[PDB]
């Protein structure tokens, strides 16, 4: 298994850690989400193109059309959270303590 598979594997791993290491900004974490699935996108293309899985070439596109589609919700919950509190800070994401 060559380095092209590996390099992007840890690209996701640092992305997976990034989303799991909220600093102060959920927007920054949100931006980490689609980069994380891009690692999924590139791995999907790399394996499929390498093995000439002809019918499976559709799958990487439709991977985008849902991860990007849910990314609309990722902004949409964010775009609404920033209204009541006034910012995207996850520090205020504790009003539901109880």
């Amino acid at each position: 298994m060559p380095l092209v598979y590996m390099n992007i594997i840890m690209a996701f791993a640092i992305a997976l850690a990034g989303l799991l290491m909220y600093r102060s900004h959920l927007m920054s974490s949100l931006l980490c989400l689609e980069g994380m699935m891009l690692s999924l996108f590139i791995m999907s293309t790399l394996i499929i193109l390498n093995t000439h899985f002809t019918l499976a070439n559709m799958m990487p596109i439709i991977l985008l059309v849902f991860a990007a589609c849910e990314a609309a919700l990722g902004l949409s919950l964010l775009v609404m959270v920033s209204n009541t509190y006034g910012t995207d800070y996850v520090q205020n994401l504790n009003l539901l303590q109880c």
């Binding site: 092209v4 193109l49 002809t54 059309v65 990007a68």
Partner: protein
């Protein structure tokens, strides 16, 4: 040397990933992954992914990366951040690059790094196959089957995206 060109594309891909995953300003984090978005297509392009590579630039890069920069241009936290403002992001920045560089050096030393998966650090050009592709581009003929063999995904994707529209307006409706 363009012997290891795909290595160069692969490594700068992740340093761009470490950039935004270090959690800088969202707008600066955005540009930190568009370069990673830019290089990722190069890896696919060098593998023969013309359409898939151009998809990253068109729907991924030129699409939803714009509205996230748009969203940050809406939010505009009382001070837009930067790599310089936070000192923790610099510590994570150097940590990620150094960790990648050492593992790369270990990978190019003995080619038998067993982290998670055992793997070979051999040349990227090696894994390629032989045999002509005829007159049909396998990357294009495969995705064209979405309307011939992808008779199910169009239904679910079309339904889901329409379902994407209703959920977006309904929750942004604000009661």
């Amino acid at each position: 040397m363009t012997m290891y060109i795909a290595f160069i594309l692969s490594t700068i891909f992740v340093i761009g990933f470490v950039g935004f995953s270090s959690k800088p300003s969202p707008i600066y984090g955005g540009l930190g992954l568009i370069v990673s978005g830019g290089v990722g297509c190069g890896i696919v392009l060098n593998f023969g992914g013309s359409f898939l590579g151009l998809m990253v630039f068109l729907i991924y890069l030129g699409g939803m990366l714009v509205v996230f920069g748009y969203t940050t241009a809406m939010a505009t936290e009382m001070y837009p951040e930067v790599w310089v403002s936070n000192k923790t992001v610099f510590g994570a920045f150097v940590s990620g690059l150094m960790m990648e560089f050492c593992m790369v050096y270990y990978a190019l030393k003995e080619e038998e790094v067993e982290i998670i998966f055992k793997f070979n650090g051999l040349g990227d050009w090696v894994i390629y196959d032989t045999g002509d592709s005829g007159f049909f581009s396998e990357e294009a003929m495969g995705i064209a089957a979405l309307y011939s063999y992808g008779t199910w995904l169009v239904i679910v994707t079309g339904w889901s995206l329409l379902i994407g529209v209703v959920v977006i307006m309904e929750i942004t409706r604000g009661n």
